């Protein structure tokens, strides 16, 4: 019953990728820390701080090289030569003290990886942070990579947050990819990195307002009976399995509630907004 | 005899902190708080559609999405001229009070607990400080030491099922979470069905009954065996709340009101006084002197010389306060939970009626805790109030349109203390937006005169008998529950 080691790093982000994966279920977070994964290094919630913590996060990166997973949450800035984001400080043999940025810290993990796990838009693609107007030169892992000619296995598990059955369910399958991969091959990927698993369907086409839709029945408010589409739903260019899934154990999701606003797409936010305007 | 103390990451707090003290006979005499990631959500937001504000401010963080949400709507109703609905009003609550209880256990438990509970010793939970003073060491009585550490953990434990049914029960009006679909400019885009009410009360229930039985009983049980945690990580004793949960459709009334307590005094919030400095933030301000937030710039500039942090420095008449729930309760000085008044009385010889009945007792790191569960409790009341009053079937949204040129403010209490969003518009479009957020007001650098921020000024006079396990440090910082997404966006 070997763990998954995981290494999980925030650059540009808001803590809303791991508060997604805190609400998972089946399994639920305490079967996913104390029986699927070995977390060890996440700011959010391990134990140790500062020197520890950090000592820890490199210790673990050489003790199971090629053999953990790098996750990554939030976006990489490259502007002001990566002082828009710092994760750390180190110190040397000395006692002298010197600050990490984000850049530094993924082109130092990322060959030590077996995988880079890309969760959120932020990280796979770049999202909010390197939306229109964005002055921190804010760029996405894949980007990131291909700028510094790092070739590691990459996959992208997007989302704004991701739901945590896209994470859990793409971890699980990198890993038992790894412990036996010809039993199981990897997850097969678009052409933007994320897996076909989740990200194949069409919204708009497996949408349950869809029988609306085409009798041309639209929502005049977001109160109103109707398909979505004049609220400014983006079911139409968004592929996820939010149909069928739907969010927090079943409970909602946004097109019942409200719009699909394509948080899971590569242009998501400027290529899906406005968002209360029709596609 | 000084030494220095620098903790970067400073963990299990949201986003991206650096803590540096200088300690001297056994106590912190100097402190620096830096935040040290910037996005430039008020830059980002620039030229949209104004409606897109309230999606696009969530992803400041996934904690407190909401309180930015409601915020951000607010400020639309406002500029856009347009009056919430009853049944808005009380949807909105619903939505944003589900997660004031998801946050608070969030944070006490699974980012505060762990400078208490010992953990199994499996990664996250380990490694940690080799002296920790822990429940497990502080208590001489092994078994009682056992028994009270393995009761606060299987809490732990427990509550990570419980923050996510608070989950549920935002998604139920909300849409998904984090980053709710379910609150627009005009009110709220689901309307509720006894059925949909019916399941977030039972959710609910769960909850609360976790909140009155669990939680509580464990921060007083905590307190009583440090003691020593209600006496120091004093600060300024200074606080500001701006109001929070209408409880009437003209914003009049609040479950916890607007107010400001400074030096000993208390004064009504009034809002042309807040101002911020960047004399130690990587800002550029054309003009000296600090900026009110209706005319805020953002220009980053992380070469500035002497800048420390990308958090601005809020004043309120140019002295720090501090937010969050000691505020909030110092401010509001609601009745105390049954519990309290019984725990109060038992495990401390301590008569308490009201929050101002724990008098010096609430400024101090074990007070920041105690105000956080006790306002847990005051919301599960107000929210069993509120599932009693919204009504299924009644209109929750109103229709608008975005005004040329307009601008508004939305005012509230994100669960780490007093948030505002300020919207100017422009040819329909966003022209400037200002975020004023809670973590902003506690873990900000000194301002231009020197003085210095909150969790700075409280960290003056914390213990430190072992400098290399300064447990202390980590427990002040946390008792404010920083959020540094909030603080920088
Ligand atoms: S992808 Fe969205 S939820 Fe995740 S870190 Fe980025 S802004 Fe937050
Ligand atoms: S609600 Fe959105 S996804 Fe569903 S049919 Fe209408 S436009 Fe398509
Ligand atoms: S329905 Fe659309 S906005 Fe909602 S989670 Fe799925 S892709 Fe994202
Ligand atoms: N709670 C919360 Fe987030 C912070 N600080 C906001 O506003
Ligand atoms: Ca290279
Ligand atoms: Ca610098
Ligand atoms: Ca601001
Ligand atoms: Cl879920
Ligand atoms: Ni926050
Ligand atoms: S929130």
């Known amino acids: 019953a070997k763990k998954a080691p995981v290494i999980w790093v925030q650059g540009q982000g808001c803590t809303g990728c791991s508060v997604s994966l805190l609400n998972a279920v089946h399994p639920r977070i305490k079967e996913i820390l104390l029986d699927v994964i070995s977390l060890e290094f996440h700011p959010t919630v391990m134990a140790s701080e500062g020197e520890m913590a950090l000592a820890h996060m490199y210790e673990i990166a050489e003790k199971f090289n090629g053999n953990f997973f790098l996750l990554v949450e939030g976006a990489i800035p490259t502007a002001k030569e990566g002082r828009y984001c710092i994760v750390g400080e180190t110190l040397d043999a000395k006692g002298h003290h010197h600050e990490v940025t984000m850049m530094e810290l993924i082109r130092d993990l990322a060959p030590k990886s077996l995988a880079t796990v890309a969760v959120g838009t932020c990280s796979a693609y770049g999202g909010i942070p390197a939306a229109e107007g964005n002055v921190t030169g804010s760029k996405s892992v894949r980007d990131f990579f291909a700028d510094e000619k790092i070739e590691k296995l990459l996959v992208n598990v997007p989302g704004c947050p991701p739901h945590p059955d896209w994470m859990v369910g793409t971890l699980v399958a990198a890993w038992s990819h790894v412990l036996n991969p010809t039993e199981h091959p990897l997850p097969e990927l678009d052409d933007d990195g994320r897996p076909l698993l989740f990200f194949g369907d069409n919204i708009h086409e497996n949408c349950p307002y869809l029988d609306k839709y085409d009798n041309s029945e639209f929502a005049e408010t977001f109160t109103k009976p109707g398909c979505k589409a004049e609220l400014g739903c983006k079911g139409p260019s968004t592929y996820a399995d939010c149909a069928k899934r739907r969010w927090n154990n079943g409970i909602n999701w946004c097109v019942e509630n409200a719009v699909c606003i394509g948080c899971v797409e590569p242009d998501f936010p400027d290529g899906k907004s406005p968002f209360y305007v029709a596609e | ?489």
Not at chain 2, 14 to 37: Q, R
Not at chain 2, 368 to 394: D, I
Not at chain 2, 446 to 457: A, C, V
């Open chain 2, 1 to 489: 005899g000084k030494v220095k103390i620098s903790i970067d990451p400073l963990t299990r707090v949201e986003g991206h902190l650096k803590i540096e003290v200088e300690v001297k006979d056994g106590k912190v005499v100097d402190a620096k708080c830096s935040g040290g990631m910037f996005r430039g959500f008020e830059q980002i937001l620039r030229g949209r559609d104004p409606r897109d504000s309230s999606q696009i401010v969530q992803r400041i963080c996934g904690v407190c999405p909401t309180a930015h949400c409601t915020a951000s709507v607010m400020a639309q109703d406002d500029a856009f001229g347009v009056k919430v609905t009853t049944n808005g009003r009380i949807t909105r609550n619903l939505i944003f009070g589900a997660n004031y209880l998801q946050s608070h256990i969030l944070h006490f438990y699974h980012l505060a607990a762990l400078d208490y509970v010992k953990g199994p010793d499996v990664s996250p939970f380990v490694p940690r400080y080799a002296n920790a003073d822990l429940l497990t060491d502080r208590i001489k009585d092994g078994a009682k030491a056992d028994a009270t550490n393995t009761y606060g953990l299987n809490q732990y434990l427990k509550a990570l099922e419980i923050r996510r049914i608070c989950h549920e029960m935002v998604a139920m009006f909300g849409g998904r979470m984090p980053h709710v679909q379910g609150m627009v400019v005009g009110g709220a885009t689901e309307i509720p069905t006894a059925d949909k009410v019916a399941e977030y009360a039972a959710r609910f229930k769960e909850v609360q009954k976790f909140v009155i039985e669990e939680y509580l009983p464990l921060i007083y049980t905590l307190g009583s065996v440090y003691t020593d945690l209600f006496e120091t990580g004093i600060g300024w004793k200074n606080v500001i709340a701006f109001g929070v949960f209408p409880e009437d459709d003209d914003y009049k009334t609040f479950l916890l009101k607007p107010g400001v307590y400074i030096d000993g005094k208390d004064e009504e919030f009034d809002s042309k006084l807040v101002k911020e400095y960047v004399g130690h933030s990587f800002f550029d301000h054309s003009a000296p002197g600090g900026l009110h937030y209706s005319v805020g710039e953002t220009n980053p500039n992380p070469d500035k010389p002497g800048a420390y942090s990308f958090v601005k420095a809020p004043r309120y008449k140019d002295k720090p306060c501090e937010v969050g729930p000691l505020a909030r309760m110092w401010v509001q000085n609601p009745e105390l939970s049954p519990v309290g008044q019984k725990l109060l009385k038992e495990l401390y010889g301590i008569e308490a009626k009201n929050f101002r009945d724990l008098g010096d007792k609430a400024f101090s790191i074990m007070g920041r805790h105690v105000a956080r569960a006790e306002e847990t409790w005051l919301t599960a009341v107000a929210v069993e109030k509120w599932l009693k009053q919204v009504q299924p079937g009644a209109e929750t949204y109103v229709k608008s349109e975005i005004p040329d040129a307009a601008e508004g403010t939305g005012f509230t209490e994100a669960p780490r203390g007093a948030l505002l969003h300020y919207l100017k518009i422009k040819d329909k479009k966003i022209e400037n937006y200002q975020i004023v957020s809670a973590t902003l007001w506690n873990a900000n650098p000194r301002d231009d005169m020197g003085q210095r921020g909150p969790i700075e000024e409280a960290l003056i006079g914390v213990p430190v008998p072992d400098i290399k396990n300064p447990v202390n440090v980590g427990r002040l910082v946390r008792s404010y529950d920083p959020x540094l997404g909030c603080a920088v966006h």
